[PDB]
Amino acid sequence: TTTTRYVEVXGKKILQTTTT
């Protein structure tokens, strides 16, 4: 939960690029 990952969403996936 920091780098470029691909979580399962909308019954598929999606790229993330959020940070804390």
Rg over CA atoms: 9 Å
Spatial order of the strands forming the largest sheet: 1-2
Residue share in helix: under 10%
Beta strands, count: 2
Beta-strand content bin:
15-25%
Task: Categorize the overall geometry.
Answer: elongated
Distance between the termini: 9 Å
**SSE string, helix = H, strand = E?**
EE
Largest sheet: 2 strands, antiparallel
* Estimated structural class: mainly beta
Q: How many helical elements?
A: 0
PDB class: de novo protein
Keywords: beta-hairpin, DE novo protein
Assembly: monomeric
Entry title: minimized average structure of DP-TT2
In short:
This protein is an all-beta fold and 20 residues long.
Sum up the structure in keywords.
monomer; 20 residues; 2 strands
Structure in words:
- The PDB classes it as de novo protein.
- The entry lists the keywords beta-hairpin, DE novo protein.
- The assembly is monomeric.
- The chain is mainly beta.
- It has strands at 6-7, 14-15.
- It has a two-stranded antiparallel sheet.
- The protein is elongated.
Layout of secondary structure:
Elements: E1 6-7, E2 14-15
Antiparallel strand pairs: 1-2
